[PDB]
Design a protein around this ligand. Sequence first.
Ligand SMILES: FC(F)(F)c1ccnc(N2CCNCC2)n1
Ligand SMILES: FC(F)(F)c1ccnc(N2CCNCC2)n1
Lengths: 268, 269
Amino acid sequence: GSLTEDGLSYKEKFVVRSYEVGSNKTATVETIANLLQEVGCNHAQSVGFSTDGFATTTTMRKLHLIWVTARMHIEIYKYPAWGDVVEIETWCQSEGRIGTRRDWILKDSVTGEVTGRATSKWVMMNQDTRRLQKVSDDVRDEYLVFCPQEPRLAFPEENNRSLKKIPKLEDPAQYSMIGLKPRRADLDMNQHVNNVTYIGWVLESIPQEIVDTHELQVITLDYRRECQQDDVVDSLTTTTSDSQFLHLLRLSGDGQEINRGTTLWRKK
Amino acid sequence: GSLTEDGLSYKEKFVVRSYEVGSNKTATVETIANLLQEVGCNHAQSVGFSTDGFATTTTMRKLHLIWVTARMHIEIYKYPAWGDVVEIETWCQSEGRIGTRRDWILKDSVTGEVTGRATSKWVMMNQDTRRLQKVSDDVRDEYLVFCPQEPRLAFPEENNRSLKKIPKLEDPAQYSMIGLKPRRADLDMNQHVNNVTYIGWVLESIPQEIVDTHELQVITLDYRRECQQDDVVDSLTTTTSNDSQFLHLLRLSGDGQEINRGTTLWRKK
Ligand SMILES: FC(F)(F)c1ccnc(N2CCNCC2)n1
Ligand SMILES: FC(F)(F)c1ccnc(N2CCNCC2)n1
């Protein structure tokens, strides 16, 4: 992997592994999400971010601040097959004092065609109190050194899916998967549940017949609260329709919302 | 006219006037460009900018700075007819240290449909030395108070026309209109040549047959240097192409110094 000539974006090639593919011998959406996170980490390291798992700036470390994902949106046109090489380009953009964005474009290395795109919204959080906050002047200045200053968006279209408001699923849910618990493989190097695990948990309540007869085209996931190592989650799903679903992850005990999202599926 | 509910954009309605229309009884592209400038001025006044003809901030007046247009890009799907009401929404965005952008959406007031869109790039300049510069931290902070912080673009599409690099027309030009001079009606309240005058001058070298048989769809104009009140301009045009496309160059009649370059795309009626 490497920064591009202008130093404002990063590219990396990945060979899809045997254990990374589903029943149709193509990468799962979780494999895709792990690759987006990996190229994001490799970009942060190349532009001088911390190497402790938190990917923080100098000012963020002095103020005890960390980034937390607020939203992940992924659209796949073609999932790469086992053994195929997929190239991913990523870049960041500052969004005033609201937070920052990380965008990605996925290409077939052989054909050069775009096979997918993704966007993520990140918000500042004080690491100790867990309280959200605005992005300060000093942090906005650090982002100007490695981000394009003119807008560059993976999802440019006006009123596109990536910015849609997601409603809250009302009981009773059409489908559910109860008692989901993370194991050590679900934790990152800082013992927090990895963001990709929540995508897997959302997908657990989709009926196996849908997965067998449809391809996942779009997934939009909001993040509200974290699942701890000893927490238990229930994954709920209702058809809103292509097939479209509304999703909700909540703690098994008190029913506290951890995530909400939507998925759009195309018949194979 | 008024700021919208969130206070991050501005809207205004205009009734197209008799002297504002061309041969097909619809607004000229110069009428459209004047309306964009007017709604831009009304937005700046509503968010606390100076009222002297230079749309300046408190920090800009302190540092003797002004904005200058670097590029204007306009795309029209339907020109409003004489007597029609056109609604225009405008907003600004900060582009880091490079400069700022002002975007516009034009709608038919009756149907609610988008009839056109425009975007403009602005660069900081010291008013005394005329030297270009980067946008300072204090100016970027002033723009955050009245601009949307998430990107809002009139031209979102990937490699869209509004960002295309424009080449320099090589002599000899296919067409030309020589000896163009501005009169007092071409000057703004600060005695500088109005930006819309340059659009008119570019269009002067398009043959009348093209204007009679085609409608202008897209115009992209780069601004490099200003024409003074006593300067004389030559307008040059060469066809580069059902659509007709042209390359344009405005230069001073004497020494041939470039003042503007641009392109136009026309569709057969
Ligand atoms: F994205 C987000 F909404 F900002 C988000 C994601 C994940 N956690 C949070 N928290 C939990 C701790 N205290 C309130 C904020 N918030
Ligand atoms: F857009 C632009 F290129 F920045 C521009 C437009 C108009 N004038 C100028 N300059 C800068 C150099 N000194 C003379 C005035 N520059």
